From a paper:
ST50, an outer-membrane protein with the molecular mass of approximately 50 kDa, is expected to be a tripartite member of the resistance-nodulation-cell division (RND) efflux system because of its high sequence identity with TolC (89%), one component of the drug efflux system AcrA-AcrB-TolC in E. coli. One outer-membrane component of the heavy metal efflux pump, CusC, also possesses an architecture similar to those of the outer-membrane multidrug efflux pumps. These tripartite efflux pumps are able to transport diverse substrates, including metal ions, dyes, detergents, antibiotics and protein toxins, from the cytoplasm to the external medium of the microorganism. Currently, the principal method to diagnose typhoid fever is TYPHIDOT, a rapid immunoassay test to detect IgM and IgG antibodies against the outer-membrane protein ST50 of S. Typhi.
To identify the immunogenic site of ST50 and investigate the structural features of this antigenic outer-membrane protein, we overexpressed ST50 from Salmonella enterica serovar Typhi in E. coli and determined its structure at a resolution of 2.98 Å. In one asymmetric unit, three protomers of ST50 form a functional trimer through interactions of the interprotomer H7/(adjacent H2, H4) coiled-coil and the antiparallel β-sheet S5/(adjacent S1). The distinct conformation and the large temperature factor of the L2 loop in the B protomer result from compression on the L2 loop by helix 1 of another adjacent ST50 molecule that is related to crystal packing (θ/A-protomer = 103.1°, θ/C-protomer = 100.2°, θ/B-protomer = 71.8°). The periplasmic entrance of ST50 adopts the resting closed state through close interactions between the α-helical inner coiled-coil (H7/H8) and the outer coiled-coil (H3/H4) through hydrogen bond networks, similar to those of TolC, Oprm and VceC8910. The hydrogen bond network comprises four key residues: Thr152, Asp153, Tyr359 and Arg364 in ST50, corresponding to Thr152, Asp153, Tyr362 and Arg367 in TolC.
Author numbering:
A (entry chain A): 1 to 427
B (entry chain C): 1 to 433
C (entry chain B): 1 to 425
Amino acid sequence: ENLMQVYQQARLSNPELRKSAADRDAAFEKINEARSPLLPQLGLGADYTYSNGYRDANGINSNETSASLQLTQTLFDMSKWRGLTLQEKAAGIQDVTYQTDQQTLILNTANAYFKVLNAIDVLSYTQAQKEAIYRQLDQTTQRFNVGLVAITDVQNARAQYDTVLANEVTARNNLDNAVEELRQVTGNYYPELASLNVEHFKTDKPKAVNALLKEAENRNLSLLQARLSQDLAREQIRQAQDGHLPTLNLTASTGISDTSYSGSKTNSTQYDDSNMGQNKIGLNFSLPLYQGGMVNSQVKQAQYNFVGASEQLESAHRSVVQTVRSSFNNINASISSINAYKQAVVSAQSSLDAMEAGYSVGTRTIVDVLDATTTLYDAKQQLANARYTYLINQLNIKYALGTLNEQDLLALNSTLGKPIPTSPESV
Amino acid sequence: ENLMQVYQQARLSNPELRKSAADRDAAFEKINEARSPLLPQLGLGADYTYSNGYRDANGINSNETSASLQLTQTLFDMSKWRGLTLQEKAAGIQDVTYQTDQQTLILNTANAYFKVLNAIDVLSYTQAQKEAIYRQLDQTTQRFNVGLVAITDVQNARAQYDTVLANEVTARNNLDNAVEELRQVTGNYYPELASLNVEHFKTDKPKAVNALLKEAENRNLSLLQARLSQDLAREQIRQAQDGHLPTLNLTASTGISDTSYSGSKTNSTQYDDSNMGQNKIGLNFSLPLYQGGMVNSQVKQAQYNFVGASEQLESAHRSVVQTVRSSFNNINASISSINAYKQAVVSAQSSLDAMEAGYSVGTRTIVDVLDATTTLYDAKQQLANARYTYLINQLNIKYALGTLNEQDLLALNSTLGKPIPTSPESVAPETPD
Amino acid sequence: ENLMQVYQQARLSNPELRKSAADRDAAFEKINEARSPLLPQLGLGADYTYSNGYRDANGINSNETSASLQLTQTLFDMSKWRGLTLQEKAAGIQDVTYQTDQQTLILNTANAYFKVLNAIDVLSYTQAQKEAIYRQLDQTTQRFNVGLVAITDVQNARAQYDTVLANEVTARNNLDNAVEELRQVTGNYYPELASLNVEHFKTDKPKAVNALLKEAENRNLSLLQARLSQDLAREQIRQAQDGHLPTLNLTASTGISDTSYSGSKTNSTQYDDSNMGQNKIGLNFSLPLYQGGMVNSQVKQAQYNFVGASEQLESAHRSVVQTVRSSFNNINASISSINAYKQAVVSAQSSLDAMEAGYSVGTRTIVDVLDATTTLYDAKQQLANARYTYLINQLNIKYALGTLNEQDLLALNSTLGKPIPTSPE
Ligand SMILES: CCCCCCCCO[C@@H]1O[C@H](CO)[C@@H](O)[C@H](O)[C@H]1O
Ligand SMILES: CCCCCCCCO[C@@H]1O[C@H](CO)[C@@H](O)[C@H](O)[C@H]1O
Ligand SMILES: CCCCCCCCO[C@@H]1O[C@H](CO)[C@@H](O)[C@H](O)[C@H]1O
Ligand SMILES: CCCCCCCCO[C@@H]1O[C@H](CO)[C@@H](O)[C@H](O)[C@H]1O
């Protein structure tokens, strides 16, 4: 019904947010795959060889039926140990990516919700303007049929009356495409929503912009993720750097191998029936000294990328400054506009009342009276819309601060009210 | 010239679409690469080594040589079998992408083509308006040069002329840039096209919206794709799962060897010239027991990706319902606008006539006659557009239902009549103004 | 303060560019990592495998120590000689992508600059319109309070006034936001900038469209990129075909090996207990004969990924042709518009006079005068806008041709001059 309920429905099922979670889940899951090369590697092998001879070996055949039980255990691989915390970091970037997506859904739903509401008001005023213009056309028509007004007055009215009728068409189509926006976001169709309580509508000027900036610094999400994506780039310098380092591998094994032989070749105590069993343990030290200049090159790029991710951060800061500062401007302009269009509506109404009392003694005409109606319901339109802009602007500030949430929608119920249906608000 | 014939000219050489064709062609070609590890691997290899013992092997100097054939045909290797049927899926997906593109080029030619006409109508009507203003200015200067009207009726009229004159410089430019956009779509410049036949024009009610949805639900190319990618992701679970399974390789070699020792402690019969030839047939078998928790971690990743692809499916669905329902609404709001602007042009006209008669007997002024001229050629414009919006929205549906077709472009030259041009009509700088 | 100076402060700091500079730098660097396999590989390993025994070979317990400087050097591997150039080409593709970023910054900085400038004018005229309407509301408020007009005149002006007040709020806000958007691109807040000099302002007709198209063909970075990338795709065809070739490989190694048996039946020959010092050296030859039609499949793909890279050029060509031709159209319609509005302002001012005249005698009413004010400070707003669009459109052409640089901004300094503040009023 109202916005909170609509969102609570929407978070329950919305693809874009769930698909974001699945990415976060996998990104956290993949840590275990990053840890695995540091854990015991155990395998089983089995061989069936067979031989022959045809030169010096003048036809010594044989065979094998071998079997292993191989173990690997890295005791010191720094590149491997580094690859784990890279994937842990990667999971962090994805979790911040996800929280960013939780706020986008709120904003997207609020907008979708207030787009529909606003669309209803544009249709209501269009209908109202239409009935106001039609009143004039109908009345002027009656006066004309008894010769009290010229034919011209009637033909000017009918013209303006048909402009609006076409306008109403667009407006009822726009409302019906707004509800379709909201159906795609929420996953549901709503015949009625909570209207805006116009009486209960107040305005609160925002916090100081330097205060808003000082906080955004701490809690903006695009900004934190940036500080994490850069930190990851730094760790990749080291993984590349760990190419200069040696490694140590424990490798234990156990196996059996029984062996046969053949025709007319040779003989003992040279060879035969064997049934070799053997257990093995081993430490493989292995250290790169110079492999083509690769490791130095891989560090350089990892560094250029770090320098690059350093730039994406300042970029992410400048966008936070732009958005916070421009959201401050925008909410202040909304409060200035609401107070403007309010005033406007009043004088638009009093000027219309003047046009009509003017039309009725000669100083004005039907075109003026009609033109007075159009400006009246345009002021009326623009006012109502400003209120919706102001609410959305309260939310965009919250978004820029990276602190948008359930409670900000919950708070918005103070200004909502009576249920309104969708077209027909006929006809 | 007309819409059918322009599309054909675009279809044959559109670089966007042929780029897709390559992507398709290549993605099918790779199947023969996804099969390659499941076939006889034959490799020939020779070498040469020299040794030199210098510790307790002082005076031991080998000098070897080898050849071989190799063969490592694989017998049971499920992952390779998998990646083959995977690459197949990747191609089937890539193809549906291509089939979508063919439908996108039909659509984007349709729009580009109708955008040009819309751009001419707007220029025709703005030019028309401009001369409707010029007659009232001209005849007013006449009435003034002999003193039948005051000069203020001349200077008021001159203004409205100049704001429409500017209005025309834009409407002109937009027709240029429309023909240029069209050229980008179809590689070609067009000096004239087939106009919309206003008289041979009729508007039909569309099918019921719930019928279109289920139609769209079974035919939508965007939808089909998302299903095959969810299905694809489903498979990659099973691929990740075959990491618990064992491999069974068949091997076989055939290689000479001539090792001939040298040195000072090559005295015994360990040293001599051995020329061991050989002929092998192997059966290597591998089966992993535990890899630090990898294969399970890989599977759990593959399952989250399946949820992902499953949610990408829902997205594709919600986007079709939005597209079908909205494109339904606009058909019904085009029809209503075509009817409402037809009526608005009748009224905006008759008003202008009474405005003039009114001006003529002093109950209105020139600034009313001119004001009514504007709302008229604004209604002619709003009307012409409602037609094109209807036709355009009619194609948006059939695209959403995955059945956008040449048959439909053909079925649109059943409303295209007399050819009209696309460049100047026509700068008239006198000046009076 | 002016566009040259502002862009200078923007070129030095702007992060989008500076990152792209670190992406060029790191594709040319990676040339070194493409070359490394043609160069001597050297390692060092210290084996230690203790080995126990059981079943038929029971009681025989060795344990080995080992060290060995390993060395590799490719003698012949063509697709290692080919992966290198393939990474020099991709580097060259980066450098062009960088050069495109250089010009975008110029266009961004210019577009941002003039948006603030034009935002100032719109706000300025809006206020001119406001004070203009206020006078009319004011003097006929007086003429009402002494019976010289009816209340209808006051209330008409009083309403059209309020429309402008509302408008002024938006116009002021737009300027505030427009400045912040300049602060992004630049990293600076600018109190005042060099305003456009409109007395000195002149419009030169462009070159011929066919000269621009011929010019674009040779110098437009989006085309050059597409060419280098197709030439990249061609070189990936040869890399695919390179799978049919032999692989010569020198290797060498010094090494040692302490072994020491310990146990029961430590009594025979074919196994040894040595301390070898091997100085192995030798050539290695590898040649594929057949791999399940892999290489052939990888060539038909590379060939398809070349008609792909080729059709992808006709796309890039149809794009530049559009941006060269349409932006030529746009600049011609700019010159036209600037002229049409120059007139429109002139004729709408003559008309505003004619209304205030007709009002004083009864041919035109209070609304007639007001509406003429509205038209006047709308022709002027439009005349002002048109001049900036023309200016940007000059750059959009230098952009399409792919030859946009500093000097084009330098040119846009004879056109600037007197400073104007960027806030109230
Ligand atoms: C590059 C990361 C900065 C921390 C390292 C200290 C300063 C860089 O020192 C570097 O240490 C490497 C160690 O082998 C060498 O290969 C480099 O040649 C050397 O310049
Ligand atoms: C954008 C809409 C255009 C119409 C706005 C016209 C403003 C009103 O203009 C009026 O028209 C009257 C008709 O009798 C004339 O007598 C007067 O010139 C004037 O009061
Ligand atoms: C009941 C104990 C499993 C042995 C019977 C084989 C049938 C179950 O299937 C097994 O599921 C496991 C999932 O952990 C996999 O590791 C095995 O590869 C798979 O064979
Ligand atoms: C029956 C089809 C057999 C296809 C296999 C040959 C495909 C053609 O590829 C050939 O491969 C040779 C390397 O083996 C190259 O030397 C030739 O230049 C090349 O033409």
